[PDB]
Write a protein that binds this ligand. Structure first.
Ligand SMILES: Nc1nn2nccc2c2ccccc12
Ligand SMILES: Nc1nn2nccc2c2ccccc12
Ligand SMILES: Nc1nn2nccc2c2ccccc12
Ligand SMILES: Nc1nn2nccc2c2ccccc12
Lengths: 265, 265
């Protein structure tokens, strides 16, 4: 299930660097035998010392499973001292860029995005994976298509008060993302910030929140809940009317949200 | 995520019946708009009364996930009184037919089959699904290819002593399947049979088991373990040398296994 290589460069022509992380890089790569483009995560083995097997079990299991809202692992290569995760390259661009570029953007659009993230994270949780790093940077659109889905592209403010813990920390992160999706700025924002987060002290301030539904605000409260016990799970969040029902509004909130994204990020 | 239809027959031409179950049928079907063949499971809604949502949640989640060793759910249609699960049609045929037809069959072949079933069932367990009905009839080859994988094709001797319970019942079933794969006959076989199962009384009888490895027998013992606590999980079984290592033998055991399948089934 792992392909072996004496030298990865016999298989891929590496191109531009797409991302860099703690102790890995993600690079764009052409498969020399086929032309096909991929995103390849490059990981030195010595960085995984100890929990090498455990992290090669997340990978061994995930290799066999394709989730609609997570970039698929097409292949794993092993050399003497590295693992290479060969991933489906997406073509739809970054989350905020997309929202800024839209002419029209509603709560229904935000709800659809969150629904997809909930589905992906529910799956990861079921598999015993706590993502711990859900944030906009790690969400990419699949394609340029108007109807493109969003996908978790990568694994390693958004951190749960208990951290500052269990799978519930991810659900907090999703709540923060939802907050940003509906107003264009983060719910917290240096010691007073740290203080705010640890007391889950945030507001739906005017004028930015005035045109947002009660249902959306309730949804966010239930995820951005200090008590990780009372906090909605992904399963609970997915049943909420804002996600599963028809309470998400159809008002164009693009002007304000985009203004705030531009100004705030 | 569910397509709605006033009449399913506007979408599919139904052909031969592929399977029948408790209160559903699986039928071969041509998509009229495209020609493409599928396997369609047809389910009256009233059969799911009560746990309708719950069973529509197994489906709602699974729709988004493709496992290499489970037939994929391509689409779900809903009419006023039925659900239709539209599945990827396989082309590789039934498990025993394939083994009888081979000229050469080894423990390594059996191990590869079990590895795949372990992977599928591990995933189902992680999702909170207990299959409860794992048996050869529910395993089909993907293609005619020599290297074809096996796939769970369907959901609803092989039943765990505790039943005669938890996800562990599936692991018992896999042990029974492994037993049959290595000798061509069931480990139990009417009141004395019921008695045997409830005491996990079985043997690796000569001459059929003489050419089988100790490693294979140990593997089977660990799954066909009366105590569901001590019983190997799918995760444990997948780490066993017979599956993960190189203890599976390379001896052609086809003559005997096929003889016994033919005679016994
Ligand atoms: N530009 C990127 N594209 N794709 N495509 C698949 C996976 C990724 C990815 C992962 C991490 C960082 C950047 C990217
Ligand atoms: N970009 C990814 N990075 N890492 N890092 C470890 C495991 C994974 C992974 C698995 C599936 C899809 C994407 C990725
Ligand atoms: N002959 C069959 N073929 N395929 N292909 C996909 C799923 C199934 C299936 C399920 C149940 C019963 C028979 C079959
Ligand atoms: N043949 C199947 N039958 N049923 N019945 C309920 C759920 C499913 C299912 C899901 C995925 C793949 C195959 C099937």
């Amino acid at each position: 299930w792992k392909k072996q290589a004496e030298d990865i460069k016999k298989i891929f022509e590496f191109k531009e660097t797409l991302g860099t992380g703690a102790f890995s890089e993600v690079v764009l790569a052409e498969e020399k035998a086929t032309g096909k483009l991929f995103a390849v995560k490059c990981i030195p083995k010595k960085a995984l010392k100890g929990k090498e097997s455990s992290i090669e079990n997340e990978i061994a299991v995930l290799r066999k499973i394709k989730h609609e809202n997570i970039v698929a692992l097409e292949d794993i290569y092993e050399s003497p001292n590295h693992l290479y995760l060969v991933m489906q390259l997406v073509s739809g661009g970054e989350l905020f860029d997309r929202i800024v570029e839209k002419g029209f953007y509603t709560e229904k659009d935000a709800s659809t995005l969150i629904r997809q993230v909930l589905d992906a994270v529910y799956y990861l949780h079921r598999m015993g994976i706590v993502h711990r790093d859900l944030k906009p940077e790690n969400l990419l659109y699949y394609s340029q298509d108007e109807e493109s889905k969003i996908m978790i592209s990568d694994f390693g403010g958004y951190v749960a008060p208990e951290v500052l813990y269990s799978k519930a920390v991810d659900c907090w992160s999703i709540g923060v993302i939802a907050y940003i999706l509906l107003c264009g700025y983060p719910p917290f924002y240096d010691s007073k910030l740290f203080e705010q987060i640890l007391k889950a002290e945030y507001e739906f301030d005017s004028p930015y929140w005035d045109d947002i539904s009660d249902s959306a605000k309730d949804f966010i409260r239930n995820l951005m809940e200090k008590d990780p016990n009372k906090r909605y799970t992904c399963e609970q969040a997915a049943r909420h009317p804002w996600i599963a029902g028809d309470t998400a509004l159809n008002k164009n909130i693009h002007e304000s949200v985009s203004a705030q994204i531009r100004k705030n990020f």
